[PDB]
């Protein structure tokens, strides 16, 4: 069904471009969002804007065409490029998470170290880490070397997932003792959709992928179902991480 397999993916490209670009313009067209910590939303938006325009189309061609790949030298510049973009959108989510953890525990001590001198250091550090893992009739198959499949899964998902649950349950302790203003339900549904969305989207792929490395077997129907779940998370990132803040909503109306 070329009608569904192209129209559905095209919807993904539109939402990812619409959400991320809208965030970049809003940050650059207001003084309310002039904080130095709001350059994380920008850099994360640039990591998710390149994956939509470059990775999804070529990957989409492989599935619907069905047979082969038009080329034999761009694969190393595509199969590696795809890994880097995906790896740099998850890795920017730990930098957002860790930023708001020091602001809540070390608040007065963290009034400094907020200068763009440090913020720029993190973003340049985020993109270089993504670079390391990305670039260490015939078809395209994601790498199936046993020493790279399990090496890149730990360093791209399972390690960044161990720093968003520890942070977001320590922030659960702070906001329950501190407020005590009958607002218990407010800060428990916000910390449940931040983590739940990130895990349901990405966990099945990095879980089944690792099983097919140690010497198990997984149906190829499910694996392709799980493969495209990771692309979905790129579109949702501007939603979860900018909707509960009043400042972003006001600036959005400034342009729309």
């Amino acid at each position: 069904v070329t009608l569904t397999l192209v129209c559905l993916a095209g919807l993904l490209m539109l939402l990812t471009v619409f959400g991320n670009v809208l965030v970049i313009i809003a940050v650059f067209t207001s003084r309310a969002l002039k904080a130095p910590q709001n350059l994380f939303l920008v850099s994360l938006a640039s990591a998710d804007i390149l994956v939509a325009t470059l990775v999804i189309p070529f990957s989409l061609a492989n599935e619907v065409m069905g047979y082969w790949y038009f080329g034999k030298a761009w694969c190393e510049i595509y199969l590696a490029l795809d890994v880097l973009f995906c790896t740099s959108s998850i890795v920017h989510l730990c930098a957002i998470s860790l930023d708001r953890y020091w602001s809540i525990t070390q608040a007065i001590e963290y009034n400094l170290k907020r200068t763009p001198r440090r913020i720029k250091a993190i973003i340049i550090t985020v993109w270089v880490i993504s670079a390391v893992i990305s670039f260490p009739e015939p078809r395209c198959e994601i790498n199936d070397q046993k020493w790279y499949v399990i090496s890149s899964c730990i360093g791209s998902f399972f390690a960044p997932c161990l720093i968003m649950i520890l942070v977001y349950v320590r922030i659960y302790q702070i906001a329950k003792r501190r407020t005590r203003q009958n607002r218990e339900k407010r800060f428990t549904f916000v910390l449940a959709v931040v983590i739940g969305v990130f895990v349901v989207c990405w966990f099945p792929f990095f879980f089944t992928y690792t099983l097919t490395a140690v010497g198990c077997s997984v149906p190829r129907t499910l694996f392709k179902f799980f493969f495209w779940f990771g692309y979905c998370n790129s579109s949702l990132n501007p939603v979860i991480y900018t909707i509960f803040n009043h400042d972003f909503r006001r600036a959005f109306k400034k342009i729309l």
Binding site: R100, N111, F187
Partner: protein, 211 residues
Amino acid sequence: AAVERSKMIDRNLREDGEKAAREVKLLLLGAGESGKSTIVKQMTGIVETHFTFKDLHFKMFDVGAQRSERKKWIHCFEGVTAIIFCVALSDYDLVLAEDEEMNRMHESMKLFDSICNNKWFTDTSIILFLNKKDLFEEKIKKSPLTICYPEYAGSNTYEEAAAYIQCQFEDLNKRKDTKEIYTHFTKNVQFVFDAVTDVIIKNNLKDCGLF
């Protein structure tokens, strides 16, 4: 050249903005016989005070001397971290000088209403000090509290009728969800630092949407 002027000067403005926007700024209020005099010592026009405590810069601005209308300069002070409001408890049997039949107690409850329930401080917390409890017990063992409060029927003591007065000052608050009043009984430069880190924490915790 009017092109090598701005670049060599605008490099001296942003170099001063972030360099001077890290301090904590506060606003003193009260009345003439409140205690503003005897709290600044422990810690014309506008006066400025600067002090430090465990590596945090405090900038306290006193606006007592300005005897002109308040609505014409109060809007200059929005965006401060908190207000610091001074009261004296030994003024429940003292009458004003210019006008009789009005206490200096009911006259401070009229300046707490104005600043607590104000349009420019709808999200700013108030740090309320209650001074002169030393002399309060002396007067309350001789002059009954009924003279000021005809509805404070209760046994007089040092800390039974001196806690009935906190209620009358925290009931005035009408923004019972957007702000909080931190009342004290003048560990006086600690109470402000304890209550300021709790205002900054709930600000960052609101950037995440958890409040």
